[PDB]
Symmetry: C5
Subunit: 70 residues, 5 copies
Amino acid sequence: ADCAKGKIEFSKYNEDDTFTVKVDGKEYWTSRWNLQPLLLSAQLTGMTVTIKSSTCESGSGFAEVQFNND
Amino acid sequence: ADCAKGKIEFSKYNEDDTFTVKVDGKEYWTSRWNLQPLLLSAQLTGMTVTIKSSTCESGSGFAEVQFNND
Amino acid sequence: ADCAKGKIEFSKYNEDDTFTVKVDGKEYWTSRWNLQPLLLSAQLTGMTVTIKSSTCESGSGFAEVQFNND
Amino acid sequence: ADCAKGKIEFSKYNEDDTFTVKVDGKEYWTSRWNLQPLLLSAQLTGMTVTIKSSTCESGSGFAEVQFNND
Amino acid sequence: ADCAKGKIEFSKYNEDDTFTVKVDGKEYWTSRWNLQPLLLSAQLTGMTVTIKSSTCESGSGFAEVQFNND
Ligand SMILES: O=C[C@H](O)[C@@H](O)[C@H](O)CO
């Protein structure tokens, strides 16, 4: 389901090789290695991201995310 | 066969590590890793892509795509 | 041997995970995975590339290229 | 620990295959190859970065970094 | 030592997977495949780069490089 739709206000490369983004005032992270360069490209180029997940509370893991232009 | 032609409406990183793009009203996906950064960049810059595949209805897989600045 | 000098008219991710470019009306492929985001960038920014190989016919494999800002 | 917040002043690919960045007048290195294209991306677009690590002297190793677009 | 300081005039993916750049009249090559996308980016954007090496004569190899903005 759709956890968070907005820009990335920040992203963070973590010690455990995971990647966090803050979207709509909610941090989420992912262990999808290959997602990384993609998220940072979204951030850098002001894309709207939709973070899609089973569990949507601030701090959970994710592996699905849509990229929209806007 | 030329399935779709146009800009990427949106893209989506999928839970099974496949990558989906929407072109001329239809959704297609790839499981070629190397394809993701490539599709993203294309969307970012408004490239015109031609998805080429075996079947062309929405939901189809593809491993072939032409990039134009068209 | 300089097979084709110019700008990339279009680029293609092949079914067989190789990469095709078209330059001064002739098409070339590389199996060099490394070269993809590179070729893609040169197209995006309209660089002059010089493709190089021992055999200069259309749909020949190549493994060397010069990226210029010409 | 927030070791340094600012813009990346320069970056350097090291002989030993680590990667250094200068932020708020201090040098930090990382061995996470994955950070390299992100950090160069952040520099070119003058994002503000926060280097995070256990220890903060100049010439320390780090693997945690926040990317602000702000 | 510092071999050359300036913008990249051209770059070249060699057959052997090495990557050659030309800076201030002098060619150098690296076999660090991670350097490739970083060096193409610096060329596209016109960063000043510093090739650091044990031997500075044109045509020699390097495994260290610094990027600066503008
Ligand atoms: O062999 C490594 C795997 O390919 C892994 O990197 C996945 O891509 C994680 O998303």
